[PDB]
Design a protein around this ligand. Structure first.
Ligand SMILES: Nc1nc(=O)c2c([nH]1)NCC([C@H](O)[C@H](O)CO)=N2
Ligand SMILES: Nc1nc(=O)c2c([nH]1)NCC([C@H](O)[C@H](O)CO)=N2
Ligand SMILES: Nc1nc(=O)c2c([nH]1)NCC([C@H](O)[C@H](O)CO)=N2
Ligand SMILES: Nc1nc(=O)c2c([nH]1)NCC([C@H](O)[C@H](O)CO)=N2
Ligand SMILES: Nc1nc(=O)c2c([nH]1)NCC([C@H](O)[C@H](O)CO)=N2
Ligand SMILES: Nc1nc(=O)c2c([nH]1)NCC([C@H](O)[C@H](O)CO)=N2
Ligand SMILES: Nc1nc(=O)c2c([nH]1)NCC([C@H](O)[C@H](O)CO)=N2
Ligand SMILES: Nc1nc(=O)c2c([nH]1)NCC([C@H](O)[C@H](O)CO)=N2
Lengths: 121, 121, 121, 121, 121, 121, 121, 121
């Protein structure tokens, strides 16, 4: 099953990071969420109730990205994956990519980050 | 067989969407279509008749993207995949990606969408 | 005097617009603000108190872009220009550009908008 | 008076061009329209009737860009400028930029074009 | 073995295409070539003689893209893949992607094309 | 008179430069040419003979950018401006911008260059 | 005299800024430098000695952008303008633009900055 | 296990290359590093000590990209992969992509390069 629902380049201003200075000033966090979902019924029916509403997913990611500051991106992606898998049974697996395009790293790069994939149990 | 014929970033202004306001105002829908097709005969012959004409594919996608407004992107991709698989036997499988770069979602993101893959029966 | 302080591509999700559907769904408004300010004293001193703090300017634009929905972009730029000119005497003139990259216009374009320039009296 | 109303990167598929092959196949024409208009009343009032409606302007450009094929870009910009100046008295002057990002020129470039500025008489 | 040598976004102005008007006027063809090559010896030695010289590959693609006009992109990719596989034994498999970002198709899209993968026999 | 004919982002691979290593290896030179030309007659007539043919201009720039290697960008822009002003009487003034996006300068920048403006005598 | 020598998008990682957290972590500073210089002799002669060497200019900007941390961007641009005007008599006037694409401002924008123009006395 | 830690578009100015002129002048090398690392413990704990610190990885890549000039990109990627695998046991496999967007190749392309994948033994 290769069907997917996606949310690309979501951007939030948060204060996560292991450095005290990071939490103080904050930065923009870029988030890409890809959900494995069989979309054939919805495609057949055209009923919004037969699929996962992207809007609601964005609200979950948002609440975690703009909520309490944590240290790791790993911790933020793990809470999002877990939160999405938990509320949606139709989501067979959730992929979360977080990117810090501007971390406190002296250098020239497009960004640094992590990506996790979590199957829904 | 990893050969493919593709159409990237096709953009149409349509009125699909589950919200009444969406159907009223409309928006730009971005479409990426990838077709699995063995292209060796055409490569050998160089005869357009031994492959699938991208132009005709664009006309099919267009007619569905710029036709009657539906609710789901899932419904639009399912009609395109089905329409392409139906008229072309050389297409072993069709992948359709639809993206709403500007849905009625209060936030900063690059876009939201769905992607389906349908083998030709 | 060609010195300037600038804020480019500020983006806010608002509900302005003359169409009822626009106010309901909303959209992203892009804002560019350029302030005419003699920056030589600050350049000499290096004291933040001798110039206009970009951060405070962004907060003013924000409060107007994310506040009460109005009809025109002209009305929004006029309130921003007026608000910035009012609180800052060092700003000799304010330029405000607002862009609706995705208005309810059936077509392919990068965006539509207005730009105003207002001298501080 | 430095106030302006703008429409950027409008794109149309037309068949203009002095070469027979051009008219046959066609291409994408990119259009940027900038109108000189005093926007202070509209900014004060917030009434759409006190300014020029971008939407209507796009419809005029469109009708000329997607209508009868002509030879020159100069001819197309002259008809647009003239058409906009004619219907709108509030437009003190009209600037039209047309770009052929892909003309029949053997080479590597971003595009070629012309730009005209026409005051409203 | 996941090692690869690549050449991205190569662009040539050619006259291929099944339409007489296309051959007359011509267009820009974008080419991406990815070669499967075990790069461990070269990585160990650092001797250019233990790998495939990207420059020579570009010259082969070029000679085919800027040579005799053909009808299909399939024919052009098949000659490139075949030409590269033929001269290089270290290339276990060749992937060729050709893109016509501006074909004679009335519409708005980023491009159309084909991609082939050919193992070296 | 604010009318102009333009050619943007023309790119050529040349060997100019004051460093021996530069002339040996070469690089990509980006060229932007803007010509001051009254385009009203052409706009009225639609006759290609009443304006300057962009294509011919590109051929002149090309012949100078891809010809004998010189030291300065200043020398290359001066020959182009002079060459265009010389063959076209309708060109009241010529602006030439040359950019070396990748010169032998150890650093991170988008490019370096020069721009000259030459009135036609 | 409209001739200019330019250096665009120079990027340096520095620790300037009025906030203690800024100086601690640092950020990327983008710099655009435009010099007014009559380039006709150099264009005529083609001798590097008749113009200002972009490379040397980049070294001056660099030494100031990557040196001692200051509070204002105004202070950094004033030292660069002054430093360039001081060593080059051929530079009639210097324009310096500094941009903080990622300042400690909670929001979505492309960047904030200042621009100064300083004539050489 | 599909979890990954990444560093994209790292850019360094180095002097590697098999051509004497290349080593003399130098160029910008773009580097993308993707590390296979199980990120579940870190996601659970949120302790930086349970994952690989991107910053330290960037310092290793940097020291190799900005150190002694070598001939091949293959040699540079092999030293980075080996260096990262060596210091981090949590990294199950390392992928290194190096790109020379501007090599001494007469032509128009986005870049050329190599990519290697090395499992940690
Ligand atoms: N892998 C990884 N994930 C993080 O979230 C992270 C990290 N590595 N290293 C340092 C860090 C810091 O607390 C701030 O970037 C320091 O300025 N955060
Ligand atoms: N997954 C998914 N597909 C849709 O087409 C869709 C959707 N989810 N959620 C809401 C929606 C709406 O009808 C409009 O976006 C509401 O403004 N359309
Ligand atoms: N010039 C101008 N400014 C606006 O703000 C504006 C406008 N023209 N025309 C229509 C409009 C509408 O209320 C919505 O775009 C309609 O969907 N808003
Ligand atoms: N300046 C200018 N404007 C044009 O519209 C134009 C032109 N110059 N030169 C040739 C041309 C042609 O008819 C087609 O580009 C030929 O393929 N059209
Ligand atoms: N699949 C595919 N490959 C081609 O090379 C091709 C094609 N389909 N369809 C039409 C065509 C034409 O000869 C020109 O695009 C017509 O203007 N060329
Ligand atoms: N202003 C200016 N124009 C040039 O063409 C130029 C220059 N300045 N400085 C050095 C240079 C060199 O010969 C090569 O860039 C050295 O690698 N060429
Ligand atoms: N106009 C202006 N220039 C600055 O350099 C500047 C500024 N305004 N405001 C605050 C600031 C700070 O020290 C840091 O951005 C605070 O995080 N620096
Ligand atoms: N595959 C491959 N890797 C390289 O590093 C390389 C290469 N091929 N070919 C030529 C080269 C050269 O030494 C310079 O590019 C020559 O200017 N370097």
């Amino acid at each position: 099953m290769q069907d997917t629902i996606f949310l690309k380049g979501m951007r939030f201003y948060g204060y996560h990071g292991a450095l005290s200075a990071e939490n103080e000033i904050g930065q923009i966090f870029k988030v890409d969420v890809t959900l494995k979902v069989d979309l054939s019924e919805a495609g057949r029916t055209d009923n919004v109730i037969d699929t996962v509403h992207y809007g609601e997913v964005f609200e979950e990611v948002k609440s975690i990205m703009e909520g309490k500051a944590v240290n790791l991106l790993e911790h933020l992606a793990e809470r999002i994956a877990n939160r999405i898998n938990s509320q949606y049974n139709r989501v067979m697996e959730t992929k979360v990519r977080i990117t810090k395009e501007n971390p406190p790293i002296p250098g020239h790069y497009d960004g640094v980050g992590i990506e996790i994939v979590r199957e829904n149990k």
